[PDB]
């Protein structure tokens, strides 16, 4: 699985 | 299953 | 399985 | 899978 934040 | 919140 | 966020 | 946000 894969999250990404900014 | 991949999340991108920017 | 690929994110690219800017 | 592929996501992207500029």
Which chains border C (3 or more CB–CB pairs < 8 Å)? A, B, D
Q: Is the CB of A2 less than 8 angstroms away from the CB of B5?
A: no
Alpha-carbon distance C2 to nearest alpha carbon in chain A (angstroms)? 8
Question: Measured on CA atoms in the order D2, A2, B4, D5, is the torsion positive or negative?
Answer: negative
Q: How was this structure determined?
A: X-ray
**Residue B4: both structure tokens together:** 């991108």
Q: What is the resolution of this structure in A?
A: 2.0
Cβ-proximal residues to C2 (8 Å cutoff; 6+ apart), any chain? B2, D1, D2, D3
Are the CB atoms for D4 and C3 separated by under 8 Å?
yes
Using a CB-CB cut-off of 8 Å, the residues of chain D touching B4 are: 3-5
Contacts of D4 in chain B (CB under 8 A): 4
């Amino acid at each position: 699985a894969i999250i990404g934040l900014m």
